């Protein structure tokens, strides 16, 4: 009778409560006998770096100078990453400079994005 409260897994009968989840991403599948097979590759692996010797800190000293925000753009990145090599080879086949015709074949495809965060 409650139309306004959100529908969750706490509400329906046993079947409803079992079937609905809370948004947690799937980790494996269900075989015969409702035995859950967890796929290792489906489990997010946290790639945590080694922080030993790291100098950066959660906060920055107020003594740092103010600066003007300059959001990175495709043009700026191209100028700062490809333009030097292009000039040096033009004065003297774009894959040599970095461009890849297609994202297929890469582990981290830029579109459709296939990596987390």
């Amino acid at each position: 009778a409650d139309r306004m409260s959100k529908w969750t897994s706490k509400r329906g009968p046993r079947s409803f409560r079992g079937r609905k989840g809370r948004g947690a991403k799937g980790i494996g599948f269900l075989t015969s006998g409702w035995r859950f097979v967890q796929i290792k590759e489906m489990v997010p692996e946290f790639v945590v770096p080694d922080l030993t010797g790291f100098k950066l800190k959660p906060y920055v000293s107020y003594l740092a100078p103010e600066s003007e925000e300059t959001p990175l753009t495709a043009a700026q990145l191209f100028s700062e990453a490809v333009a030097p090599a292009i000039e040096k080879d033009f004065k003297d086949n774009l894959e040599k400079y970095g461009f890849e015709p297609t994202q297929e074949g890469k582990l981290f495809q830029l579109y459709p994005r296939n990596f987390l965060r």
Binding site: A1, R3, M4, R11, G12, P13, F16
Partner: protein, 45 residues
Amino acid sequence: ARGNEYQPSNIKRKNKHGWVRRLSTPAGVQVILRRMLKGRKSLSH
């Protein structure tokens, strides 16, 4: 004797007045459209 005509069951509620059943027919889609036009917070049951 009377008054308790509502015997709640979420299965019947959803199968009878749910979003899926509303969209299952053009008449139900127009029900949803009317609720949307009126600005109902709850479009379906």
